[PDB]
Design a binder for this molecule. Structure first.
Ligand code: NI
Lengths: 234, 15
């Protein structure tokens, strides 16, 4: 622990701190969530998570030299908090958690988008609850309306030549996580077609030239699933 | 099924 230190973090996070004071608090909490056992994460709990999500909302609502670092450090704290079942369960109990992870998919902050996309991908493949992919898509829809963009555009932007290989891989990994776990053939075919129409068709040609095994693994999953679906439609 | 093996490969990639 200590257990007392968890309560101290909550009190600090609720205190109205900003800028580098906030980042310094977040960095200390990120270490504690990584180094302490799950029991400590449970002591920090739903209330600790809620304090983190309230700040992240505020950071969006007020459009700050430290904003992008504070948003990403919060995402790092969520990455640690969600590295166990209790954390996952507690995040999925929130009303706004998934939406805030989707709003973290900003390709202009690529390492934050990578971290958030990985967390989302892991939710989608969970045995339970089922159909987390649907909740992710609901939140992508809400973000699209709020940002006035097409809903898959952030994922496409992540695949543009110019981005890091790690971001490209995380984008295609989330695409696969949205499609592959779905039981309904016609839904898989639909989503795939929506991505193709937005521009994935052209992008894929560029991705296949990349000599990176992690990319090849995701392209393989994507192409096979596509092939099976079209087979099943005949 | 082939889809379930694929899901397992996605999980292994995330780990
Ligand atoms: Ni302080």
């Amino acid at each position: 622990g200590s257990e007392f230190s968890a309560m101290m973090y909550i009190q600090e996070l609720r205190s109205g701190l900003r800028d580098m004071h906030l980042l310094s608090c977040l960095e200390s909490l990120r270490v504690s969530l990584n180094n302490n056992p799950v029991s400590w994460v449970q002591t920090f709990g739903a209330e600790g998570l809620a304090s983190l999500l309230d700040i992240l909302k505020r950071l969006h609502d007020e459009k700050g030299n430290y904003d992008s670092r504070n948003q990403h450090e919060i995402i790092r704290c969520l990455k640690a908090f969600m590295n166990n079942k209790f954390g996952i369960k507690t995040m999925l109990e929130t009303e706004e958690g998934i939406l805030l992870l989707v709003r973290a998919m900003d390709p202009a902050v690529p390492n934050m988008m990578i971290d958030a996309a990985k967390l989302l991908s892991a939710l989608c493949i969970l045995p339970q609850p089922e159909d987390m992919n649907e909740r992710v898509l609901e939140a992508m829809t809400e973000r699209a309306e709020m940002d006035e963009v097409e809903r898959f555009q952030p994922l496409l932007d992540g695949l543009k030549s110019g981005t890091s290989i790690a971001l490209k891989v995380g984008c295609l990994q989330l695409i696969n996580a949205l499609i592959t776990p779905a039981e309904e053939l016609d839904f898989r075919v639909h989503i795939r077609s929506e991505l193709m129409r937005l521009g994935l068709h052209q992008v894929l040609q560029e991705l296949r030239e990349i000599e990176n095994e992690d990319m090849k693994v995701q392209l393989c999953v994507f192409d096979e699933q596509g092939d099976e679906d079209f087979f099943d439609l005949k | 099924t082939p889809r379930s093996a694929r899901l397992e490969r996605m999980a292994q990639a995330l780990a």
